[PDB]
Amino acid sequence: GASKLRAVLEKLKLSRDDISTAAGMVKGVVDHLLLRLKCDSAFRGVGLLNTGSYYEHVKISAPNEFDVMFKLEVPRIQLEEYSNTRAYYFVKFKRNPKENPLSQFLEGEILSASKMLSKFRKIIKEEINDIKDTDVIMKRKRGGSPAVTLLISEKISVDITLALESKSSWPASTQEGLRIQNWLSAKVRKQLRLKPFYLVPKHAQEETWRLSFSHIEKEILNNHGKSKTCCENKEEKCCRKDCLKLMKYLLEQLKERFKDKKHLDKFSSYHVKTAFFHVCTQNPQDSQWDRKDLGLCFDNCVTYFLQCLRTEKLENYFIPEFNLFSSNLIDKRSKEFLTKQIEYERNNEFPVFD
Numbered sequence: 100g101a102s103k104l105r106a107v108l109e110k111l112k113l114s115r116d117d118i119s120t121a122a123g124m125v126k127g128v129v130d131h132l133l134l135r136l137k138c139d140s141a142f143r144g145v146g147l148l149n150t151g152s153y154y155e156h157v158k159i160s161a162p163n164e165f166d167v168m169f170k171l172e173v174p175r176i177q178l179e180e181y182s183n184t185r186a187y188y189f190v191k192f193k194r195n196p197k198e199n200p201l202s203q204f205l206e207g208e209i210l211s212a213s214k215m216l217s218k219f220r221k222i223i224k225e226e227i228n229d230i231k232d233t234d235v236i237m238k239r240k241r242g243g244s245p246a247v248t249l250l251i252s253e254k255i256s257v258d259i260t261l262a263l264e265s266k267s268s269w270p271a272s273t274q275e276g277l278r279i280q281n282w283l284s285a286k287v288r289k290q291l292r293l294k295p296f297y298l299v300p301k302h303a304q305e306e307t308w309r310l311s312f313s314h315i316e317k318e319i320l321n322n323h324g325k326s327k328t329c330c331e332n333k334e335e336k337c338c339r340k341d342c343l344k345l346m347k348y349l350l351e352q353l354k355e356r357f358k359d360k361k362h363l364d365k366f367s368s369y370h371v372k373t374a375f376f377h378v379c380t381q382n383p384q385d386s387q388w389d390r391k392d393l394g395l396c397f398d399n400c401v402t403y404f405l406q407c408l409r410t411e412k413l414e415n416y417f418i419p420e421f422n423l424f425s426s427n428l429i430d431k432r433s434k435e436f437l438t439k440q441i442e443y444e445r446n447n448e449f450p451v452f453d
């Protein structure tokens with residue numbers, strides 16, 4: 100029951116905690132990019148999102164794949180929702196010193212993502228060659244975010260996303276989102292909602308940006324209990340983080356198994372992570388997440404995610420009217436394929452964790 104799950108969580112811990120020079124190679128490459136980008140008119144205010152975090156792993160089993168975010172403070176930003184999408188926006192400016200650092204990317208009153216990504220990719224291309232230390236090659240694929248993919252030596256890949264940062268109130272599409280009031284409290288919601296938000300270049304091909312709150316997600320996960328003391332007693336933690344890891348590895352393993360088929364290509368840890376936050380709101384009490392009940396708690400997540408694929412509904416945790424499971428985003432057959440693969444996993448004591 101929880102035996103296989105515990106063994107899985109223990110191997111994942113050991114693979115994550117093991118000694119590697121990977122993060123060292125990555126830190127040096129990034130610090131180098133940042134110092135080059137800073138002596139440029141457009142990117143003088145560029146910085147790492149979380150200062151101290153380079154080893155940010157989206158994949159729970161990939162210790163050689165890194166995900167880094169470079170944020171750029173955009174003061175006096177004006178947002179205009181694109182085509183009732185709730186999550187995609189045009190970036191405009193209120194403007195007084197109109198010859199602003201980003202004026203070079205303006206296509207009318209509109210901030211071009213394409214023009215900003217071009218300049219950014221170019222400066223990064225210029226710094227990659229100038230490196231005499233390690234073997235770094237700039238892999239380019241169709242995608243606004245991650246803007247860049249670097250490959251340091253073998254297996255060490257780094258995804259770089261450029262993100263605009265806004266320190267203004269969150270867009271109206273978020274007003275009913277982050278329903279943590281009965282779990283984390285109403286005062287925690289007000290405090291997180293006073294924090295900045297990020298816009299990443301992304302299409303739903305227009306010059307649009309997608310809202311990003313992964314820094315709020317990171318804060319929640321490190322202070323996730325109804326009680327302020329949750330997991331401070333290491334002998335009696337809750338199994339919240341474990342259930343999330345297991346949901347991520349389940350999907351990772353199913354994607355690896357069916358990589359030749361194209362059916363699971365559109366699913367990502369983001370879908371499984373969002374579903375897990377919806378189960379947190381559903382089950383707000385720390386007693387609903389006992390370390391002893393790992394198996395049952397994991398089943399609660401599996402069943403809820405399964406309900407989501409079947410009903411074709413998975414709301415974005417921050418933007419309630421953004422449906423991650425819409426038929427225009429992911430077609431029914433792909434969803435039915437995932438439901439079938441997950442149902443087989445549950446009914447065969449998750450063979451993907453063998």
Ligand SMILES: Cn1nc(-c2ccc(F)cc2)cc1C(=O)O
Nearest residue numbers: 186309310311367369415418421
């Ligand atoms: C599949 N997906 N959707 C998002 C998303 C992010 C912000 C939004 F407002 C809406 C959607 C991120 C991912 C991912 O990481 O795959």
Ligand SMILES: [Zn+2]
Nearest residue numbers: 324329330337
């Ligand atoms: Zn806890």
